[PDB]
Amino acid sequence: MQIFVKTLTGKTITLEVEPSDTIENVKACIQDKEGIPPDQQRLIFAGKQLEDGRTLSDYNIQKESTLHLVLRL
Amino acid sequence: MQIFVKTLTGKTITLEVEPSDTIENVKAKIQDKEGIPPDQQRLIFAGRQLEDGRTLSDYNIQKESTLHLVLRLRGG
Amino acid sequence: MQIFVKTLTGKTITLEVEPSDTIENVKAKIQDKEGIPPDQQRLIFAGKQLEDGRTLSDYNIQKESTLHLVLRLRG
Amino acid sequence: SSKAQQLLQGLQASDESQQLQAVIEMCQLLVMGNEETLGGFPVKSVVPALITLLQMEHNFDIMNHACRALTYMMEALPRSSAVVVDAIPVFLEKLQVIQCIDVAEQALTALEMLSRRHSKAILQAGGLADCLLYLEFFSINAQRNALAIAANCCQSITPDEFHFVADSLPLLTQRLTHQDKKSVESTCLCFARLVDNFQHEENLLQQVASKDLLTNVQQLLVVTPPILSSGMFIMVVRMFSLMCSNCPTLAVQLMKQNIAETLHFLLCGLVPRSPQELYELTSLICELMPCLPKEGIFAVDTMLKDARAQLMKEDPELAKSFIKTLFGVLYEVYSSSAGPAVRHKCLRAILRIIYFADAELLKDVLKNHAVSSHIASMLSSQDLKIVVGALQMAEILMQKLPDIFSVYFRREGVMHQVKHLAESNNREKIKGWIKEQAHKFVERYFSSLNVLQRLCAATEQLNLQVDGGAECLVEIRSIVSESDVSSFEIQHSGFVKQLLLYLTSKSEKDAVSREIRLKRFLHVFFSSPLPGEEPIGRVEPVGNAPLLALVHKMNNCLSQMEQFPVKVALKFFNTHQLKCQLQRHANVKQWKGGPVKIDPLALVQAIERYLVVRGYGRVEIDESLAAVRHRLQFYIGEHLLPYNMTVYQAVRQFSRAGIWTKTHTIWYKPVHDELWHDGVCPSVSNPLEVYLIPTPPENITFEDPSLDVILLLRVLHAISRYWYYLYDNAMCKEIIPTSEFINSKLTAKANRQLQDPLVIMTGNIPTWLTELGKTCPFFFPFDTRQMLFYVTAFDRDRAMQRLLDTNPESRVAPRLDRKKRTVNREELLKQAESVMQDLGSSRAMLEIQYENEVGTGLGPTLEFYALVSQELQRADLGLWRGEEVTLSNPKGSQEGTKYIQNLQGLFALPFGRTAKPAHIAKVKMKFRFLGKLMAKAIMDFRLVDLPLGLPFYKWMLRQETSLTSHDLFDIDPVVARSVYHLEDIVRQKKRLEQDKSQTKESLQYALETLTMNGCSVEDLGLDFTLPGFPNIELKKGGKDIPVTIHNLEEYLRLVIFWALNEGVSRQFDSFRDGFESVFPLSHLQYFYPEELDQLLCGSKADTWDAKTLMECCRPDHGYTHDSRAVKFLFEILSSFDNEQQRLFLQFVTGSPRLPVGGFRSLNPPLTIVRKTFESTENPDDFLPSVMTCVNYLKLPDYSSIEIMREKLLIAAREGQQSFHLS
């Protein structure tokens, strides 16, 4: 399936993932495609601050879903 | 036979059930005694949650069993 | 009208296809031939990937053609 | 803030729905924001409103949102946790009585987040029991948070308060045996912190220890695989050390619980471990034993820097059992390490054990061990603690058992060392004490043999001026093989130098020539034929034991006398930076700014760029000049500063505390063909004469008392490798395989030196290691040489990347560039050539993307390297020998394309004097591309798939002049038989001509009569064309000159020279030119011709099996161990003939090769997980998924092994050369 990620500055980065993937893998792909280290990255969705070590199947993410990425200082 | 149920605030409840009664029957009896909705309880015995479709003999529940009552809420 | 579907390495499968149809029907036929699920199969024709939800009429696909097969598995 | 104020007024309301909307909007606004966006938010007023709203329990749905809002306020900005942290009593009170699980869980998470910086408040609030009142029947994700907050509360506990943790101590003690990992780690950390903080109160330690904690920690430690990490392993062992040292009664109780068996299982079960773990274990062993008296001969300890004794005075059965159990293991650990602290701790432990034991136990335990040799070797050491330890050990041991230790010391060379020792204030005092003690020892005890005299008599006959025949050598062999000569008599009686001058001397004054001496040595040791009686057949002796025995004795002797120094901060380097002053050496501007920022790891190129941008480079910030040619140069003294050099190293070398403190100054300134006519060829070089020299090589500069043994071992290795060049006929075979020359202690020292981060930060590897690696490479195995080459050959970033990839360890973070190129799968050769020509010499890693693909990372680059390696072998180019084959399982267009394949190896085709210039130009260009590709692939730790041959590697290592007839077997097998038979015939020809009892006519008739398999040379009718290539002339006119007996040696020499050196010269010159444009060939001198294959390509193929698979494979996410699909896949994996193995490797990792070490060497372990499907489609007609970037395998659950087999093959075959998912 395809997912879109957008930041505060404004940019739509498209990724293609699978329900059995890992959130850490998605963060690593984002780091490779953009250069943002996977330590200041925060992924929020539907009000939760999604944690690491889980799978996208837990968070009932479906086709054509939008995620939010906010950095930290 | 009678069993004991302990909830999050104590309140040891003595409930009379039968070995052939399913967990659904025990839940119905508990609701009749108190009134907790079926969608909020998370009955766990000996650290393992009790499936509604099973019976007392499936979980080896015997006389004077000390059941534990655990509440539940929606996630998100 | 016996259009051919050729896999990557060496395999070729015949397929009788209706003139106007959706991609899902051809996919079902290919699955009956081989057994590829509707999550990893992509069709390439000429120099473009056949997008789903359309018909062969708009893709200029006529009788007695060849469709190459690619499986979307790796990452 | 405008919406924030409105949210505040909404929060300060009364309507329940209004409050719910307010808190929902509050959390929504808080989670999305960050420090920059949410600036100016009022907290001092909003936070009390939130606290008041949370201080109400008439609703169950808004409490969750209030706790969530507070948690997200904490998480959004780490600055409000000084005012936000005020509701701790409310949190604790809500924990006392529970009505909803979710609110308690969120409160636990918030409290755990708070405890990081404010634990004193919660400690005063008495929440240690409040948390874990109802620890059970919670979720899995909250138990770890509760244990973490408990540990953080116990991090800083005062001795005054104990009742806050006394109630919960048994609960945690029982919890210490849970099956999970993080819970056990947290409980262990809590107990470690408690024991560490309560160290000065014996009663508190006794209260904490109890009797279940010790046994639970024991079973936790013994049970394997290790559920406890290495750091917390060290922490637990240190907790044992503290309890044993600070409380003797606890130590006695721990000893009573047979801890000796546990320590034995930990140490050996020796299991390889980090030096810190061994140090902690040795400290524990030392602390279990009674303390040393401070009166007597132990008074030196005061200047160098009880209940166990009662138990020993009691029934000593336990002490005897402990000593007999662990003395051998302690000595084994001591004799297999190289480190300043571990050696000292082991010495102290052994000294205590020797002192406190009785005579019978010491006699029993010191039977299958060598102590005198170690004492003698450790007496003479610059580290002036080991000398004192050795002297004390000798005194005690010989005072307890005089009779047994009266001949061992005299034979092993201790008495002589003590005699030599006997013959700004602490150093003088300890020297005086050592002198006085040695004098007393010698004067008191040692005041007033057929092996040493025999060896002296034998070595007297080895002098060059006097002939000795061969009796001296057989006597020396007898002494070396069947005797018990020590390592002190070999040194005392000059034998190593006499043997060195016997083997490697050449002068007119010598009584016997060097050739005869070499023959005599090769006859006495090894069974080579005696000089003057060479058999007419072929030399192939069997016996080689004496040489192996001599080599082993020399290695032991070198290990005894070796004295090389090992040298094994981070925050200092990472924090403090350098300041330097620039002074003109005058067309450029004069510097007046003063101090200059100089990063310790910075290079001079950055300084040059800064100077150019600043405007000092002229003859405003401008980027055109920065955006090759060199205009400015930096100098220090009379030595030029290389660009690839760090300023710290420059200061250390050309210009310690002064390096980082004192200011440094750097100046700046603007910048007849005999072969073709006659038919003569150069002679075959013999490598042995380069090695046979008594003087040390120019590369050796270090001074050690163990250099003669090194020289002798070098000479012996040279003789063993090159011994068939001294005979007219022989077969190439090493007398002793080179794996048997490895020294067990030098390798350990090198490995220890190659693990310190700082010495790789600064690149300060000592001279001895590099010189030994470059001059005598046989002293280390392959892994050490590869590590040294990678560390010292390139920049520091690559070295630290290699260290991180081979040894997981003020945190280091390598910094590297990353430049990406895109190619297409239709013109791979041209695009690869363009990429290599553009970015070959760039010091940045090369990642390659694809046009119609989205996937990026290492997998595409590995696939590109594999494709280029395969493409370089097409039969159309015509570069190598071999046969033409068709590749198995080709692509759509790759089918039908011939490829060059050979069973033995690949060698370059020769050309003569009639080759078209365009063909030669094409060959040279292709060779340059291949050389540059290999050079770039070696740097970036990438792997290729090019099966090269041995002569190729010999050419690479500059060994083209030592290619004899035995090297044709690895190139062309059919012509080798003809060459060998012609050599056999020419030997007979020479033998016949060496007889003078004939006539000219008879000699001619005998020469003509000679036949080859019933046919004569005239009948053969050969010529001067290289066999197999009927287009190359060995010499001019080689078409009308038939071969005869009179011209046969010249013909054979011409054939060999043309087929190995002459016709393949320009090609390899082009290869060398292409390779040296990246990094010089001089860095490959570490390796050997048979070892470069492992460095370049992958490891040798081998069959896979589950026993070694149960060491790196780690399944999770629905595939716990002892499942069905995992075992089905594991069984089906080991059913391949390496073809499907390569297919699977390219499917998962992306390369058809594996790193050295097998499945363990792969940094990301093969992690197998389940795949989520729907409830309608059967989980049978689906294909497995792979993420090659991190090696994440997603394998569907199935029911039949046959289905697994039939679908994995299709998945591998029909999903190659594509990345359509990322």
Author numbering:
A (entry chain C): 1 to 73
B (entry chain D): 1 to 76
C (entry chain B): 1 to 75
D (entry chain A): 484 to 752, 764 to 799, 866 to 983, 1131 to 1155, 1165 to 1284, 1305 to 1321, 1325 to 1358, 1373 to 1380, ...
From the article:
In humans, a major E3 ligase responsible for generating K29 linkages and branched chains, TRIP12, is central to cellular signaling and human health. TRIP12 regulates diverse cellular pathways—including cell division, DNA-damage responses, gene expression, differentiation, and small-molecule-induced targeted protein degradation. Here we utilize biochemistry, chemistry, and cryo-EM to define the catalytic architecture producing K29 linkages and K29/K48 branches for the human HECT E3 TRIP12. The structure resembles a pincer clamped around the acceptor Ub.
In brief, TRIP12’s active site Cys2007 was stably linked to a chemical warhead installed between the donor Ub’s C-terminus and K29C of the proximal Ub in a K48-linked di-Ub chain. Importantly, our chemical biology tool maintains the native number of bonds between the TRIP12 catalytic Cys, the donor Ub’s penultimate residue G75, and the α-carbon of the acceptor site. Higher-resolution insights—including details of the active site—were obtained with a truncated version of TRIP12, termed TRIP12ΔN. TRIP12ΔN lacks the intrinsically-disordered N-terminal region (residues 1–477) that was not visible in the map of the full-length complex. One sample represents the transition state for TRIP12ΔN generating a branched K29/K48-linked chain. TRIP12’s preference for a K48-linked Ub chain substrate was revealed by the structures representing branched chain formation. The I44-centered hydrophobic patches of both Ubs in the K48-linked substrate bind adjacent surfaces on TRIP12’s ARM repeats. The arrangement of TRIP12’s tandem Ub binding sites is exclusively compatible with a K48-linked chain, not other linkages. The structure also explains why the proximal Ub is the acceptor: it faces the ubiquitylation active site. The acceptor Ub’s residue 29 (here a chemically modified Cys, but normally a Lys) is situated in a fiveway junction together with the donor Ub and the C- and N-lobes and extreme C-terminal element of TRIP12’s HECT domain.
